[PDB]
Write a protein that binds this ligand. Structure first.
Ligand SMILES: O=c1[nH]c(=O)c2[nH+]cn([C@@H]3O[C@H](COP(=O)(O)O)[C@@H](O)[C@H]3O)c2[nH]1
Ligand SMILES: O=c1[nH]c(=O)c2[nH+]cn([C@@H]3O[C@H](COP(=O)(O)O)[C@@H](O)[C@H]3O)c2[nH]1
Ligand SMILES: O=c1[nH]c(=O)c2[nH+]cn([C@@H]3O[C@H](COP(=O)(O)O)[C@@H](O)[C@H]3O)c2[nH]1
Ligand SMILES: O=c1[nH]c(=O)c2[nH+]cn([C@@H]3O[C@H](COP(=O)(O)O)[C@@H](O)[C@H]3O)c2[nH]1
Lengths: 380, 380, 380, 380
């Protein structure tokens, strides 16, 4: 391993705050760009956003809200198989075109071939994963999300291969990985969508507790290079703080992004708001935090207990409705695509160029040297 | 686009706080350097400063004040065509040599061929842009500023070409761009002066909301390279916080700079001062903030509404008169030209050299390890 | 020295916060990885951790606690030879398998060939170093730690050679060094284990007072390269703040780490807790601080007094028991080895790869943009 | 100037916080290293320290105190020629070996060939510079310091050449410069000692107001390269915050350093202490601040008034005596020379090597993650 010894520090990594997209000749206005993305032949989104499979982010109510805005929700797995199946049934029974009380239309709703809202569901690697997958498919789930901390592991890959073999037609998302070799290993066993991100999440301590990770722009770019070879897709999962980071994640190769923090504290996230000193907040916590792993309500098999936590528990200010949050994100995405001359997301992924910057460039990019007197809806 | 794919992260960008000017052999004292600049055959400034075309920076009163100090003001377009024409008439009727009450002389006033103070005016891309340009020219405007967020866009370039074709002699400023190709596209349709800057403004959130921009020293240098080929000029617009940044912007290739924040809160900026807890302040806000776009007084056509804001609203401490602010900026410019051995701005643009530095170099450059006991007039 | 003149600034250095470990294909779960390390033929640890030889970190009580968890303690030398010999006798008489009051077992205890807890002891370079070493060996010490600020010095190397010559079988740790040439100079006189680190300690001011040091990841990597050539080992000493830094230190080539700050404020560190404003704390101080050097209780020879201090005196929040702290560190190490696919520490040292990152990458690695509401046991 | 255009951003610059000295094999203990330096054949210091020629740093009382510790003071020029001559006479009449009340010896005093304390004096470029130089020489001054903001200027070089021509034997210090070409231009007209530094001072705003400067480690190294060719010396002037920065400045090529901030607030600096909220402080201000330039006591010719200030006015905590401050600095220098294996300053300048580091390396170098409970005498 003298070869590995001499190359220990060769690789370099970039994150969102290291880069900007370069403006380019543009023939398309922001309101005319196409935000649609085909994640798999049977799974098309109208906005490139997945809500995170976390017990403070996505149950039925969030999955309904985000699918009606054109995305898709991943119902978390910290519940019994029967409970998670019923959450999916709630999504598939929900109104997808519009509701009255006076007329709220959902013209951009992401739907299956039968006009029902799309919905996804997380599963782990446990003895009962096949049963959970079976009951989710029977409930009408549109994608299974094999959600693991280290997707590039023999045990995970073997479990996916067995799932792919028994359930030949379900769309399989699997993750997380952060390297080309990890993405390739998953696509080679039949994964449809690879989820990218080790450590970048707002609530996570993986990089500090284990010392492991890849800066997220590099992780996306390295994994998207492999996805292009297979003709498949990736989800850029974690570390997105502003709408501009979504544009960066997609331009680096992401077909869609997954959001935790930016959707935390919305009306449709699980739990209720709590008033503290005249201010509204909601809980947001890592799925590897102590509170999230100490779940024990009805019985379910959980992933093998980790010795020490890899997330923290926190609270976020109340944000409002999912519809209003998505409206702000979409406006930012459309603005960025207009600046880069991208009429659709394929052009953004394939053609856009970045410029690297220092911490001084970052300070120039935010507002600077001004006393802000009102919070902007997209800059809180 | 495998070529674009492999070069996604090739480009690097520098901003003001990344660089310093290197001192050089100097035969000229600061008081003897020449700060004049010809922006176009009919538009000569005595100090290389344009005031920003913003509704909290420049109306008639600011345009008069800054032209009397040797610069030029861009009257903003958030008003009716008739109102904006009358603002220009106020500037062109104002005294340009001196006034009494006891004798205030303006020996460095920038004037047209008839001895009237110079004045510029912003226009957008709307159906009535030709009428606005016509009435501004009839009012005696010295330059039209085609003010757009993304100047490198087919719609903007087509509108400029049509304007250039109907009004063959007016000086046209157009922007904003941040790349060589964007500058070239504008000069090729007859723009006289290209305005450079995407995202660096103090009050702006473009880089964070859309993910797009270029660090401003690189943007200036890339665009000035093209201006040199055409024998035309550029305005370095945005991100200047100190007089030393003006010297940097000009040495990077800028023929002149445009200032928002450094002129905000002056007596001549629009609005009145407001006392808050014994301290004086004035409002300063992005033209892409909610308050600035929600203007609706007399009717006018506005640029197409953007879905989400790209600026914030803020307040700045009262600064004093435009004359005293310009005096401090000019003293800093003259000092920098003396250090670089530049007898005039052409030598500064063409000959001066920079040295790149880290964040540690930046901390050494400011005052450090001292409890400042009085604010300096040029270091507040 | 024109050769030295032209290469003054050639070398570059990395520390923990500059790098992350890259995840790799993994066939081993965290609970099955092997944390054992042979530091020398007669000195095997079950977890790769040495407690620092400091008078606020390690006396008999800490050495017992950490050996029972699988590591080894270095009893400090700021005491008489007789006192330090008695501390070692206390360790070697202590129960190593388990104790009652109800049954506390120590299944991972690091023991000598007679079933007694391992223990090490610091010595200096003074006239009586041979006598101190003799009495420590008679007490049953398992390793002597020649503890000096600048191990790459003629006086230190000559003293070690004389010790190695009189005491032919004792395990000798010597330090500190930070360069390949310094490590080589010590291994060449018979040192068994080289201790690496000049300036990285939490409580130390060496780099700021003397201007001297090497960023600690580079120091480890440079010295481990030499250790590999000799077939010997190194201790990565100083600058570790989180369990993830331990994984980084070992992957950079360290066979084991030495901890001060992460063990300060434990029940078993010397001194008692002091309540200040309802909060518990303990003292932690550099061995080069004024208070630590002004020791004058029973008489002992001290290293030559330094003119000015090179450490500070501080206080740390109470941490709890050594057992609970080690449990958190080990969980983090096991998680990192699982992510890197390392079944044992040899694979981590020899095979793991890093990715370099900016300050923006570091901010993404920690929790960001969240109001943490409870402290994590491994993220305080 | 297409050659200058393409090389605008080629040069890179380092400051103190960017680098560390690498430890090396050492045969010399800190107490045995030689801190002497010959600045010129008739000017030898016993510690390599000049006190700054500033009206809040050096008059007779500071010049006496620092010469008795082995350095030399530069009496500032913000006073009449007669007054400045009398300050020098006070220094040359002062006791240099020792004083009683009980016996204070000054065994390291820097003295002239007649046993009188060394002393230097600042002069400017004015019409009466020849008269000031004449009266200072008649008073027995050991060096004249031509103190200008931009030493690489025709007017300064012409004035120095005329001085060198009339006063053929006085030691001439001249500055400030920051480039090889500026140093060469001064040595070529007969300057004995070149003073290096544009912008790094604690109290100065030159880099922010004018945009001009060179990071100080690079400035020293570039200028020392020229000094080596001429067989002459340089003073590293400005930006030194800790004793470790002195070691860095000398290892980068400086023969001696000049200190402002580290000597401000001492008993011997001009002015008295002022109690503010139970705490002692003294004034410290740039010679380019408004208060320092608005001096108008007895009449003197001042350098041409600059339009705008290039320094600020501040206050520093009381530090104690010059003797105690120098003792701490010398201890740090001796420690660094011991670590680098430098028996004298020539070896430090010629042989020592640096390692470059990031901001993460800097945070590791200072104390980190500790609540300091007492201020160290060399780390306040
Ligand atoms: O290392 C981790 N420890 C955790 O406890 C944890 N919880 C969530 N996640 C991941 O973070 C993503 C959400 O990130 P953001 O809040 O930044 O959008 C999610 O989509 C997950 O990928 C975790 N990662
Ligand atoms: O992205 C933007 N969103 C906005 O809302 C906005 N408002 C002003 N500007 C631009 O900023 C310039 C002034 O910048 P400074 O205050 O830094 O001088 C101005 O001259 C404009 O170029 C904006 N840019
Ligand atoms: O330069 C120094 N001056 C000091 O006063 C000092 N005291 C301890 N040490 C060293 O720091 C190590 C502990 O570092 P941490 O607290 O970061 O674990 C220890 O293991 C030592 O190597 C010192 N280094
Ligand atoms: O640009 C400047 N504007 C000023 O007003 C000023 N005053 C002092 N100096 C220079 O700073 C040096 C002292 O620096 P320190 O306090 O960092 O030691 C001094 O030795 C001078 O070289 C100035 N430089």
């Amino acid at each position: 391993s003298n070869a590995m010894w001499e190359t220990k520090f060769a690789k370099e990594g970039l994150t969102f705050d290291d880069v900007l997209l370069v403006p380019a000749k543009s023939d398309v206005l922001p309101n005319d760009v196409d935000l649609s993305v085909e994640m798999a032949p049977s799974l098309k989104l109208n906005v490139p956003i997945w809500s995170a499979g976390m017990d403070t982010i996505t149950e039925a109510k969030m999955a309904i809200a985000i699918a009606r805005q054109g995305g898709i929700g991943v119902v978390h797995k910290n519940m019994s198989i029967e409970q998670q199946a019923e959450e999916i049934e709630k999504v598939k029974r929900s109104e997808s075109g519009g509701i009255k009380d006076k007329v709220i239309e959902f013209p951009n709703s992401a739907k299956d071939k039968h006009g029902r809202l799309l919905a996804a569901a997380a599963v782990g690697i446990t003895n009962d994963t096949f049963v959970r997958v079976e009951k989710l498919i029977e409930a009408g789930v549109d994608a299974i999300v094999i959600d693991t901390a280290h997707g590039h592991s023999a045990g995970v890959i073997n479990k996916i291969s067995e799932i792919r073999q028994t359930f030949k037609d379900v769309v399989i998302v699997a993750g997380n990985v952060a390297t080309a070799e990890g993405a390739r290993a998953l696509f080679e066993v039949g994964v449809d969508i690879v989820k990218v991100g080790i450590g970048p999440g707002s609530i996570c301590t993986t990089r500090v507790v284990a010392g492991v990770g890849v800066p997220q722009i590099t992780a996306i770019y390295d994994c998207a290079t492999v996805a292009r070879e297979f003709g498949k897709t990736i989800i850029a999962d974690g570390g997105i703080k502003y709408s501009g980071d979504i544009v960066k994640a997609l331009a680096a190769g992401g077909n869609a992004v997954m959001l935790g923090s930016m959707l935390a504290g919305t009306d449709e996230s699980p739990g209720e708001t709590e008033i503290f000193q005249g201010r509204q907040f909601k809980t947001y916590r890592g799925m590897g935090s102590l509170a999230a792993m100490e779940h024990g309500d009805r019985y379910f098999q959980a992933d093998a207990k980790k010795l020490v936590p890899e997330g923290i528990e926190g609270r976020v200010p109340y944000k409002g409705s999912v519809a209003d949050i998505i409206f702000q994100l979409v406006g930012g995405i459309r603005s960025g695509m207009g600046y880069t001359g991208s009429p659709d997301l394929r052009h953004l992924r394939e053609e856009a160029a970045f410029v690297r910057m220092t911490g001084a460039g970052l300070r120039e990019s935010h507002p600077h040297d001004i006393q802000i007197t009102k919070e902007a809806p997209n800059y809180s």
